[PDB]
Design an enzyme around this catalytic site. Structure first.
Site, mmCIF file in Angstrom:
data_model
loop_
_atom_site.group_PDB
_atom_site.id
_atom_site.type_symbol
_atom_site.label_atom_id
_atom_site.label_comp_id
_atom_site.label_asym_id
_atom_site.label_seq_id
_atom_site.Cartn_x
_atom_site.Cartn_y
_atom_site.Cartn_z
ATOM 1 N N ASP A 242 -31.441 130.934 -11.729
ATOM 2 C CA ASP A 242 -31.719 130.469 -10.326
ATOM 3 C C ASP A 242 -30.471 130.218 -9.714
ATOM 4 O OD1 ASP A 242 -33.221 129.686 -8.458
ATOM 5 O OD2 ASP A 242 -33.675 127.844 -9.154
ATOM 6 N N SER B 6 -27.195 137.931 7.216
ATOM 7 C CA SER B 6 -27.376 139.318 7.408
ATOM 8 C C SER B 6 -27.420 139.940 8.665
ATOM 9 C CB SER B 6 -28.813 139.650 6.708
ATOM 10 O OG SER B 6 -29.178 141.102 7.001
HETATM 11 N N1 LIG Z 1 -34.789 128.203 -6.278
HETATM 12 N N2 LIG Z 1 -35.144 128.422 -5.227
HETATM 13 C C1 LIG Z 1 -36.109 127.679 -4.525
HETATM 14 O O1 LIG Z 1 -36.366 126.464 -5.103
HETATM 15 C C2 LIG Z 1 -36.499 127.919 -3.152
HETATM 16 C C3 LIG Z 1 -35.942 127.197 -2.241
HETATM 17 C C4 LIG Z 1 -34.571 127.147 -2.081
HETATM 18 C C5 LIG Z 1 -33.961 126.351 -0.971
HETATM 19 C C6 LIG Z 1 -34.797 125.799 0.153
HETATM 20 F F1 LIG Z 1 -34.155 125.079 1.104
HETATM 21 C C7 LIG Z 1 -36.034 126.126 -0.015
HETATM 22 C C8 LIG Z 1 -36.725 126.760 -1.078
#
Ligand SMILES: NNC(=O)Cc1ccc(F)cc1
Length: 330
Positions: A35, A199
Site C-alpha cells: 500500500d 497530473s
Molecule cells: N491506502 N489508501 C487509502 O487509505 C486511501 C486514502 C489515502 C489518503 C487519503 F487522504 C484518503 C484516502
C-alpha cells in the site's frame, strides 16, 4: 541489494493485489497488500481476536527466533474506506523477493475491522508511503522501503500491476524490459506523507487532451481512480446510459456498454487507461448494471490514482533525497 516479488490480484476484479512476504525465523510467509498510501506493516497474528480471524494466515511471533517485542509500543490505523486495525509491535526479519531487512517493525493486530476479517486473502498490509505517516506510538517506526533504502543498489521501488493478471514489485532497480518508450518523471510533495504529484490533465476516449493541473496520490492500496467531479462527469457523459447512483454509491453503466479509454498526463507524456480497465462488473450478482472504475473524489479530500490508473503504467517510486515519481507505458 535488490528484491523482486510477484503481486497477484485477489479476485477477478483486481480489487487488490497480494505479495508474499517472509517474516521471522524460520520464515512465516504471509500474503500482504502493498500500500503506497499508508506506512504501517501490520499482520494478522496469534494475538488477533480469534473471532476476527476467518481464513487468514497468521504470524506467530513466539515461533520466530528473531522476533522481539517493542516494549509498550502500540499502533492504530484507519483507512480511506473506513476500515481499521490496531495492536502491539514486534521487530523481526522481513524479506520481500530476496531482499532482507533485519529489525523491521512488524505490527501485530489485536483487533481488525469487519472488512479485514471478511477478506480471507489478505493477511496484512505493507505500507510504502513515507514513514512520517507510521502510526506506532510512542516512537514512530520506518517502512520496509525506508529501512531497505541504504542497502539498495538504487533508492527506488517500482510497481508493475497487471490487468486481470499478476504483476511485479521490484526494489532497488528499474527493469528496462518491463515498459515501452521512456519513463517520464514528475515532482513529488511529501508534505502530507504521500506520493503526491500533479497530473497535467486528461482526455476521454479519442477526445482532445485538456491541460489542467490535478493534484493526487499514487496509491496501490486503493482499487479505483478518484478524480474531481468535473473530470469524472466528462468521462461518464461519453457512456450511453451511465449515471451517478446515490443508492449504489457512484457511477454505474449498462454492462453491455463499450467504455472509452481515459488518458492522464504525466508532464508532457500520457498514460492511456483502456476502457476495459474501467469496468468493475455487475453492481450485484446477476445485475445488468455495472460499477464504474473512475469515480468522484469529492468528499475524500484528495484525488487518488489507485490501481485502475497505476496498472496502466510502469511506475517508479524514487526515494532519493528529493523523491520523484516516474511513469511509463507498457
Ligand atoms: N491506502 N489508501 C487509502 O487509505 C486511501 C486514502 C489515502 C489518503 C487519503 F487522504 C484518503 C484516502
Amino acid at each position: 541489494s535488490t528484491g523482486s516479488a510477484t503481486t497477484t490480484p485477489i479476485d477477478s476484479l483486481d480489487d487488490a493485489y497480494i505479495t508474499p512476504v517472509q517474516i521471522g525465523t524460520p520464515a512465516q510467509t504471509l500474503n500482504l497488500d502493498f500500500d503506497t498510501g499508508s506506512s504501517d506493516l501490520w499482520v494478522f497474528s496469534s494475538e488477533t481476536t480469534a473471532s476476527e480471524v476467518d481464513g487468514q494466515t497468521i504470524y506467530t511471533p513466539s515461533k520466530s527466533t528473531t522476533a522481539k517485542l517493542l516494549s509498550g509500543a502500540t499502533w492504530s490505523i484507519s483507512y480511506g474506506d473506513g476500515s481499521s486495525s490496531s495492536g502491539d509491535v514486534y521487530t523481526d526479519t522481513v524479506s520481500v523477493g530476496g531482499l532482507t531487512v533485519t529489525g523491521q517493525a512488524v505490527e501485530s493486530a489485536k483487533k481488525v475491522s469487519s472488512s479485514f476479517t471478511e477478506d480471507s486473502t489478505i493477511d496484512g498490509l505493507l505500507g510504502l508511503a513515507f514513514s512520517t505517516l507510521n502510526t506506532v506510538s510512542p516512537t514512530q517506526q520506518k517502512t520496509f522501503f525506508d529501512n531497505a533504502k541504504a542497502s539498495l543498489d538504487s533508492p527506488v521501488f517500482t510497481a508493475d500491476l497487471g490487468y486481470h493478471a499478476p504483476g511485479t514489485y521490484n526494489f532497488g532497480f528499474i527493469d528496462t524490459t518491463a515498459y515501452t518508450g521512456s519513463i517520464t518523471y514528475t515532482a513529488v510533495s511529501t508534505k502530507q506523507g504521500f506520493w503526491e504529484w500533479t497530473s497535467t490533465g486528461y482526455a476521454v476516449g479519442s477526445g482532445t487532451f485538456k491541460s489542467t493541473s490535478i493534484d493526487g496520490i499514487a496509491d496501490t492500496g486503493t482499487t479505483l481512480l478518484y478524480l474531481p467531479a468535473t473530470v469524472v462527469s466528462a468521462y461518464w457523459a461519453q457512456v450511453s446510459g451511465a449515471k451517478s447512483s446515490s443508492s449504489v454509491g457512484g457511477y454505474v453503466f449498462p454492462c453491455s456498454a463499450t467504455l472509452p479509454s481515459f488518458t492522464f498526463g504525466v508532464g508532457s507524456a500520457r498514460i492511456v487507461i483502456p476502457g476495459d480497465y474501467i469496468d468493475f462488473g455487475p453492481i450485484s450478482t446477476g445485475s445488468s448494471s455495472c460499477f464504474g472504475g473512475i469515480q468522484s473524489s469529492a468528499g475524500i479530500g484528495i484525488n487518488i490514482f489507485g490501481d485502475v490508473a497505476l496498472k496502466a503504467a510502469f511506475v517508479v517510486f524514487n526515494g532519493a533525497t528529493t523523491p520523484t515519481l516516474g511513469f511509463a507505458s507498457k
